[PDB]
Design a protein around this ligand. Structure first.
Ligand SMILES: OC[C@H]1O[C@](CO)(OC[C@@]2(OC[C@H]3O[C@@](CO)(OC[C@H]4O[C@@](CO)(OC[C@H]5O[C@@](CO)(OC[C@H]6O[C@@](CO)(OC[C@H]7O[C@](O)(CO)[C@@H](O)[C@@H]7O)[C@@H](O)[C@@H]6O)[C@@H](O)[C@@H]5O)[C@@H](O)[C@@H]4O)[C@@H](O)[C@@H]3O)O[C@H](CO[C@]3(CO)O[C@H](CO[C@]4(CO)O[C@H](CO[C@]5(CO)O[C@H](CO[C@]6(CO)O[C@H](CO[C@]7(CO)O[C@H](CO[C@]8(CO)O[C@H](CO)[C@@H](O)[C@@H]8O)[C@@H](O)[C@@H]7O)[C@@H](O)[C@@H]6O)[C@@H](O)[C@@H]5O)[C@@H](O)[C@@H]4O)[C@@H](O)[C@@H]3O)[C@@H](O)[C@@H]2O)[C@@H](O)[C@@H]1O
Ligand SMILES: OC[C@H]1O[C@@](CO)(OC[C@H]2O[C@@](CO)(OC[C@H]3O[C@@](CO)(OC[C@H]4O[C@@](CO)(OC[C@H]5O[C@](O)(CO)[C@@H](O)[C@@H]5O)[C@@H](O)[C@@H]4O)[C@@H](O)[C@@H]3O)[C@@H](O)[C@@H]2O)[C@@H](O)[C@@H]1O
Lengths: 497, 63, 63, 435
C-alpha cells in the first residue's frame, strides 16, 4: 500500500483537523482532563511537581475528582506520576476532592498536602466541605490522616463554603493556611496559624472579599518588594483571574479591607481572559510560574463559550509572571516554551482580498483590507510586529481562515477601546469576550502567538496575555485584517517543532 | 433494556412555579426532585431512579 | 382562543391525572404544579410554541 | 497452560472487629459493619483493637490505629489478588419516635429538637378514651403501650428506651374547632413592647382573628412555646428608620427553630421588613434578600395624596385578593390608603431590571426566587410574593409594599374607606394559610 500525501503547503482551503487525546506543551493526559492546578516546588528534586484533579466527561455521581501528579522543571515538558490521592467512598466526606495546597516539612521530612473533601448529598448537620491532610515520605505514596477534620462551622464560618486551603511559611517560622470561606453572608479569607502543621489556631480573618464576591484558589506570595494575592473570581459574570498588590503583608491585608477597591493597576488587576481559571503560582527561587486550565468547549465549537460560566477543566497552561518597576504583574511566555521552537517555516501570501500592498517583508493594510497566509501546523509560534497609524486602530488576527471558510475566529486589538476582543466573524459575527491591557504610546505592537493543537496564547508587547481555545486552528491558514485604521505588519516569522 | 428516555425529555417535563413549561431555561440544569415543580405526566412516562417502577413499591429503580 | 381551550383541556387532564402518584408528595417530596394557560389573545408564534411544548410533554416516548 | 496465575482462591471475609470495647455486627449482603456505642460516647478518636480477617487476608486499617468515626469509613480487605470493600458505621444509641397517631389523625407536628408532639384531634371525640399508636426507628421500647387507651387532657409523657439511650417526649392534643394562629414579636408581651406599628398590628390581630396567640423570640428560643402547635405565624417586623436593617440577634438565633417549623409544614405571613428573613429560612431558591429597601422615621412620616395602589394583573382569582373595595370597575387596580394619610416609605420589594439586580424579567425573577408575583408596584416591582411548599413544607406570603400600614401619626386611620383593604387582605391571607 502506497500512502498518498496531500498538498498541505500550497492550499488555503479549510480543513477539518482533530485533536489528539494527549498534549505535550500545554499538558493534558491521554485519559481525562486537568482541573484546578496545584503547583509546588520540590526542595529535594529541584523541580516543579504540579498536581491537579482528573476530570472526566462522564463523572460519577458520588465519588470523583481524584488527584494526579505531574512533574516538570521548566513548564514545557511534563511527565505523569499517576494517581497520588484517590477519592474516598460514597459515604465518606472526601468523596469529591477539591483544590488544595502542598508544603514540605524538613522537621519530619514529609510532604503535607491539604485538600478539600466534599460530602456527597450532605445533611443539615453534616459539613459540606472539610479540609483534610495527606502525608507522603517521598511524594510517591500518600496516606490520609484520618484524625484530621478542620470543620468550617467550628470557627463560625459557612458549612457549605469552606474551600481552597493554601499553605505558606513566613520568615518568623510559623505556617499560615488561608481558607476561602463565607462568614455571615460575606466572603472571608480566614487565616490559621500552626507551628507543626498538626494543631491549628484560627488567627482571626486574614482578608475580606470585594463586593460580596467569592475568591477561588487564593495564593499569597512575595516577589522582591511586594506582596501579591492571586485569586480566581467565582462570580458568573466575571469568571476571571485578578490579583492584589501590597508593599507589606499589612498593606495587602488593608487592601479592600471594607469595600476599599484599591486596584493594583488601571485594569482592575486583570491577568487573562475567560479562558484562564484557577491560576496558582509557584516559584523555584529565580522565576515564578502560574498554572491554570484553558477550558474546553461543548460540541468542539469555538463560538460556544456557554452561558453563565464555561465548561470545567481542560488543558493545563503555564505562564511566567513578570513584575514591572511599579509592582504591576503581567504574564509572559515561559523561556523553555519559547526556545523549544527551533525549525522555521516559510510564509507566503495565499489570498489578496483587500487593498493591501506588499514590499517584501512589509505589508501595509488599510481599513477593510486583509491578507491570508499559508497553513499552520500542530505546534506553531507566530511572531510579528505591527505599527499602527495612531492609537485608535482596529487590527485583528483571524484563525480557522480559508478561501471557503464561512466563519473564522478572530482576536481584534482595539486601540480606541484600549483592549482586545475574541469574537467569531463570518456569517454569525458573534462577540465572545475581551481583555483589557495597556496601549503602547508608540503605536507599536509585538505580537507572539504560541499555539499547541487547539490552545493558543497571544502575547502583545509584553503587556497583554490572551489565552484562547480555538479548535481546527492547526493545519489551517491564518490571516491579518484591519477594520478602521491603517496598519503596517512586518517581521512575520512562523516556527514549528 | 432499549429505548431509554433522555434527560432532555425529563427537563422538558420539568415546569416552573406558575405551572407552565420552561420555554427557554428548561435544559439549563437537570431536573431536581426536591426543588423543581414537575408535570405529573413525567412519572407516568419516565421511570426515574429512586422511584417505583410502574407504580410497584417492590421494584424501586436504582442508579 | 379555541386552540388554547383545547390545550387547557389537555393540561387540566394532566393536572387531574394523579390517582396513582398522589403519595409521591409525602414519600419523595415531589411537587406537582401544572396549570391551564390563561384565556387571552395570543400571537401565532407564541401559540405554536405552546402547542409544540404541549405535544412534547404529552406524547413523549410515544414515537 | 491456560490459567493466568492470579491466585484468585483467597478469601476476604471479615469475621468480627472490635472498636475500643464495642464489638461490631457484620452483614455480608451489603458489606456493612455496624458498631453500637452509648449515646454520650465520643467517636472522634476511636481506636482499633482487633480485626480478625480470613487466612492470609490484609486490610487497609491496622490494629491500633486511631480513626475518626463520625462518618462511615471504607475498608478494603485484600487476599492475593482479590479484594472486598466494606463500610464501617459507628452508631450512637438513639431512640426517636418517627410518627404518632391518635387513632384518627396520622398527621401531627413532631419535633425531636424539643421532643414535642402537637396534635389537632377535634374535641368532639372524648379525650379520656384516646389511644395512641406510634412508629419508631428500631428496637426502641416506649413505656406507654402502643395503641393504649390513655387520657390526653394533660400533656402526656412518653419515654423511649434503647439500650443505653433514654429519652423523653411530651405529647399534647388540643383544638377548639378553630386552628390557632400566632403572632411573633420582638420581645416581651404585647403590652410591654416598642414599635407601635407592630403593637397596633398585634392588637388588631387579637381583635379580629378568633383564637389568636402571641409568642416572642425569647420564648421560642428557650422553649416556653412550641412553633408546631400553631399552623400560621404572622411577623410584621418594622424598623424605626434606615434601609435593609439587620435582623435582631434573637431572631437570628430562633431562625433554626423557625426553619425546622417551616420544614414541618407551618404557614408564614411575613410583612414590611420581615422579608429579609426568608434568606435565613432558606425559603427563596436564590437565598437572597429583596434588593429594594428604604426607611423613614415614624416620628415625621411623609403625607401625600397620591393614590398608591397595587396592579394585580393575573392574580385576581387568588383568595388573597377577595372581597376588596375597588374604587371603580378596574378590578386589576387595588387602591389602599389614598389621599392625605400618614404613610411611611418602609417598603421592601424586588426590582424587575437588569442594570443593578439579577432580575432582568419576570421569568428570571420567578426562576431564581422560585415564587409567584401576586402583585406589582406599577414600576416593574414585585411587592407581593407567594412561596408554595418545596417538600411537605409550609406556604409563605411576603408583603413588601408601602401601602401595608396599621398605625400612623394620623388619627383614626380607619376613617379613609381605602385603608380597610389592608385589613381585608390580612384576613384573606390568614384564612388562606389556615385552609
Ligand atoms: O458597600 C456599600 C453598600 O453597597 C451594598 C454593597 O454590597 O450593596 C448594594 C449594591 O447594590 C447596587 C445598587 O443598588 C442600588 C441601585 O441604584 O440601590 C439599591 C439600594 O438602594 C435603595 C435605597 O433606598 O434604593 C435605591 C434604588 O432603588 C430605587 C427603586 O428601585 O429607589 C426608589 C426610590 O423611590 C422612593 C421615593 O423617593 O421611594 C419610593 C416610594 O414610592 C413607592 O413607589 C409607592 O409609594 C414606594 O415604592 C415607596 O413608598 C425612595 O424612597 C427610593 O429611594 C431606585 O430609584 C434606586 O436606584 C434601595 O432600593 C436599595 O436598598 C444602588 O444603591 C446601588 O448602586 O451597591 C453597591 C454599588 O457598587 C457598585 C455599583 O453598581 O457595584 C459594583 C460591584 O458589584 C458587582 C458584583 O460585585 O460588580 C459589577 C460591576 O463592577 C465592575 C466595575 O467595578 O463592572 C465590571 C463588570 O460588570 C459589568 C457586567 O455587566 O461589565 C460590563 C462591561 O461591559 C463590557 C466591557 O467589559 O462591554 C463589552 C461589550 O463589547 C462590545 C459590545 O458588543 O464589543 C464591541 C466591539 O469591541 C464593543 O462595542 C463593546 O466592547 C463587554 O466585554 C463588557 O460587558 C459593565 O457593564 C458591568 O459593570 C467589573 O470590572 C467590575 O465588577 C456589578 O455588576 C455587580 O453588582 C461596583 O462596581 C459599584 O461600586 C454594590 O456593591 C451592591 O450590589 C451593601 O452590601 C453595602 O452596604
Ligand atoms: O461534578 C459536577 C460538575 O460540576 C463540576 C465543576 O467543577 O464539579 C463540581 C465540584 O467540583 C468541586 C470539587 O470537586 O470544586 C471544583 C474545584 O474547582 C474550584 C476552583 O478552584 O471551583 C471552581 C468551580 O466551582 C463551581 C462549580 O463547582 O462552584 C462551586 C460551588 O460550590 C458551592 O459551595 C455549592 O454549594 C458554591 O459556592 C458554588 O456553587 C463553579 O463556581 C466553578 O466551576 C475549586 O473551588 C474546587 O476545588 C466542588 O466544589 C464541586 O462540587 C464538574 O467537575 C462536574 O462536571
Amino acid at each position: 500500500p502506497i500512502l498518498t500525501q496531500k498538498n498541505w503547503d500550497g492550499t488555503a482551503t479549510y480543513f477539518q483537523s482533530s485533536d489528539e487525546h494527549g498534549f505535550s506543551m500545554y499538558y493534558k493526559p491521554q485519559v481525562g482532563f486537568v482541573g484546578a492546578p496545584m503547583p509546588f516546588y520540590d526542595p529535594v528534586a529541584k523541580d516543579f511537581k504540579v498536581m491537579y484533579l482528573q476530570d472526566y466527561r462522564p463523572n460519577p455521581e458520588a465519588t470523583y475528582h481524584p488527584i494526579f501528579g505531574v512533574a516538570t522543571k521548566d513548564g514545557a515538558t511534563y511527565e505523569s506520576l499517576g494517581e497520588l490521592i484517590s477519592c474516598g467512598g460514597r459515604d465518606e466526606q472526601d468523596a469529591a476532592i477539591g483544590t488544595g495546597g502542598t508544603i514540605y516539612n524538613p522537621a519530619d521530612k514529609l510532604y503535607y498536602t491539604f485538600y478539600t473533601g466534599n460530602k456527597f448529598k450532605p445533611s443539615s448537620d453534616q459539613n459540606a466541605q472539610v479540609v483534610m491532610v495527606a502525608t507522603s515520605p517521598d511524594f510517591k505514596t500518600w496516606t490520609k490522616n484520618r484524625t484530621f477534620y478542620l470543620k468550617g462551622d467550628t470557627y463560625g464560618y459557612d458549612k457549605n463554603d469552606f474551600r481552597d486551603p493554601f499553605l505558606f511559611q513566613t520568615e518568623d517560622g510559623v505556617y499560615h493556611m488561608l481558607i476561602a470561606t463565607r462568614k455571615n453572608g460575606k466572603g472571608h479569607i480566614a487565616e490559621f496559624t500552626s507551628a507543626d502543621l498538626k494543631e491549628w489556631e484560627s488567627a482571626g480573618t486574614f482578608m475580606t472579599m470585594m463586593w460580596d464576591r467569592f475568591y477561588e484558589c487564593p495564593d499569597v506570595f512575595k516577589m522582591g518588594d511586594w506582596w501579591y494575592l492571586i485569586y480566581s473570581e467565582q462570580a458568573s459574570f466575571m469568571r476571571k483571574v485578578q490579583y492584589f498588590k501590597g508593599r507589606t503583608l499589612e498593606d495587602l491585608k488593608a487592601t479592600t479591607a471594607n469595600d476599599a477597591g484599591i486596584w493594583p493597576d488601571n485594569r482592575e488587576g486583570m491577568l487573562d481572559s475567560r479562558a484562564f481559571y484557577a491560576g496558582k503560582t509557584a516559584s523555584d527561587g529565580t522565576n515564578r510560574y502560574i498554572w491554570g486550565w484553558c477550558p474546553t468547549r461543548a460540541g468542539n465549537d469555538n463560538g460556544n463559550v456557554g452561558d453563565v460560566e464555561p465548561e470545567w477543566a481542560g488543558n493545563l497552561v503555564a505562564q511566567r509572571l513578570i513584575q514591572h518597576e511599579d509592582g504591576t504583574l503581567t504574564l509572559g511566555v515561559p523561556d523553555a516554551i519559547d526556545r523549544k521552537y527551533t525549525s522555521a517555516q516559510e510564509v507566503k501570501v495565499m489570498a489578496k482580498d483587500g487593498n493591501m500592498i506588499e514590499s517584501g517583508k512589509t505589508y501595509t493594510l488599510g481599513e477593510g483590507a486583509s491578507v491570508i497566509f499559508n497553513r499552520l501546523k500542530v505546534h506553531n509560534k507566530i511572531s510579528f510586529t505591527v505599527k499602527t497609524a495612531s492609537n485608535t486602530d482596529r487590527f485583528g488576527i483571524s484563525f480557522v481562515r480559508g478561501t471557503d471558510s464561512a466563519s473564522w475566529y478572530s482576536i481584534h486589538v482595539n486601540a480606541d477601546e484600549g483592549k482586545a476582543n475574541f469574537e467569531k466573524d463570518g456569517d454569525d459575527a458573534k462577540y465572545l469576550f475581551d481583555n483589557k491591557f495597556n496601549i503602547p504610546a508608540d503605536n507599536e505592537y509585538r505580537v507572539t502567538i504560541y499555539s499547541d493543537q487547539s490552545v493558543c496564547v497571544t502575547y502583545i508587547n509584553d503587556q497583554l496575555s490572551f489565552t484562547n481555545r480555538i479548535y481546527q486552528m492547526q493545519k489551517n491558514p491564518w490571516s491579518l485584517c484591519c477594520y478602521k485604521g491603517e496598519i503596517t505588519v512586518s517581521d512575520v516569522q512562523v516556527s514549528t517543532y | 433494556d432499549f429505548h431509554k428516555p433522555s434527560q432532555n425529555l425529563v427537563n422538558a417535563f420539568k415546569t416552573d412555579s406558575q405551572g407552565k413549561p420552561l420555554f427557554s431555561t428548561y435544559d439549563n440544569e437537570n431536573y431536581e426532585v426536591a426543588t423543581d415543580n414537575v408535570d405529573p405526566r413525567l412519572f407516568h412516562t419516565v421511570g426515574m431512579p429512586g422511584f417505583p417502577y410502574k407504580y410497584n413499591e417492590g421494584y424501586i429503580i436504582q442508579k | 382562543t379555541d386552540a388554547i381551550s383545547l390545550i387547557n383541556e389537555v393540561r387540566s387532564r394532566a393536572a387531574g391525572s394523579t390517582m396513582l402518584i398522589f403519595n409521591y408528595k409525602e414519600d419523595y417530596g415531589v411537587n406537582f404544579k401544572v396549570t391551564p394557560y390563561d384565556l387571552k389573545a395570543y400571537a401565532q408564534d407564541e401559540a405554536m410554541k405552546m402547542l409544540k411544548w404541549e405535544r412534547r410533554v404529552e406524547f413523549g416516548m410515544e414515537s | 497452560d491456560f490459567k493466568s496465575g492470579l491466585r484468585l482462591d483467597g478469601d476476604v471475609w471479615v469475621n468480627s472487629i472490635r472498636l475500643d470495647e464495642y464489638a461490631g455486627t457484620v452483614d455480608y449482603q451489603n458489606k456493612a459493619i455496624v458498631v453500637g456505642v452509648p449515646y454520650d460516647y465520643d467517636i472522634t478518636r476511636m481506636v482499633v483493637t482487633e480485626m480478625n480477617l480470613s487466612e492470609g487476608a490484609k486490610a487497609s486499617i491496622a490494629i491500633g490505629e486511631t480513626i475518626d468515626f463520625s462518618l462511615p469509613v471504607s475498608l478494603t480487605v485484600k487476599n492475593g489478588d482479590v479484594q472486598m470493600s466494606y463500610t464501617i458505621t459507628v452508631k450512637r444509641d438513639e431512640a426517636k419516635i418517627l410518627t404518632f397517631k391518635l387513632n384518627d389523625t396520622y398527621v401531627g407536628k413532631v419535633d425531636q429538637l424539643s421532643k414535642t408532639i402537637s396534635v389537632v384531634v377535634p374535641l368532639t371525640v372524648d379525650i379520656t378514651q384516646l389511644k395512641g399508636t406510634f412508629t419508631v426507628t428500631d428496637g426502641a421500647t416506649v413505656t406507654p403501650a402502643s395503641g393504649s387507651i390513655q387520657d390526653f387532657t394533660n400533656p402526656v409523657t412518653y419515654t423511649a428506651t434503647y439500650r443505653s439511650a433514654v429519652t423523653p417526649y411530651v405529647v399534647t392534643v388540643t383544638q377548639g374547632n378553630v386552628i390557632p394562629t400566632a403572632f411573633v414579636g420582638t420581645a416581651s408581651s404585647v403590652s410591654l413592647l416598642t414599635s407601635p406599628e407592630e403593637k397596633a398590628a398585634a392588637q388588631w390581630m387579637m381583635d379580629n382573628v378568633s383564637m389568636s396567640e402571641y409568642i416572642s423570640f425569647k420564648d421560642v428560643v428557650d422553649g416556653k412555646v412550641d412553633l408546631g402547635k400553631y399552623t400560621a405565624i404572622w411577623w410584621h417586623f418594622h424598623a424605626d428608620n434606615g434601609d435593609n436593617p439587620p435582623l435582631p440577634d434573637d431572631a437570628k438565633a430562633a431562625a433554626e427553630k423557625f426553619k425546622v417549623y417551616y420544614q414541618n409544614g407551618g404557614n408564614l405571613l411575613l410583612t414590611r421588613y420581615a422579608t429579609f428573613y426568608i434568606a435565613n429560612l432558606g425559603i427563596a431558591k436564590d437565598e437572597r434578600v429583596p434588593n429594594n429597601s428604604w426607611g423613614g422615621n415614624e416620628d415625621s412620616p411623609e403625607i401625600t395624596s397620591a393614590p398608591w395602589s397595587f396592579l394585580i394583573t393575573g392574580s385576581e382569582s387568588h383568595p388573597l385578593f377577595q372581597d376588596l373595595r375597588w374604587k371603580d370597575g378596574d378590578k386589576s387596580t387595588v387602591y389602599t390608603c389614598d389621599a392625605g394619610y400618614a404613610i411611611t416609605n418602609s417598603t421592601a420589594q424586588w426590582h424587575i431590571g437588569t442594570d443593578w439586580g439579577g432580575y432582568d424579567d419576570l421569568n428570571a425573577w420567578r426562576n431564581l426566587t422560585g415564587g409567584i408575583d401576586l402583585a406589582h408596584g406599577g414600576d416593574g416591582a414585585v411587592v407581593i410574593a407567594e412561596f408554595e411548599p418545596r417538600s411537605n413544607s409550609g406556604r409563605t406570603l411576603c408583603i413588601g409594599s408601602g401601602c401595608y400600614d396599621w398605625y400612623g401619626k394620623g388619627v383614626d386611620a380607619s376613617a379613609d374607606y381605602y385603608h380597610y383593604n389592608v385589613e381585608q387582605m390580612t384576613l384573606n391571607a390568614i384564612n388562606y394559610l389556615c385552609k
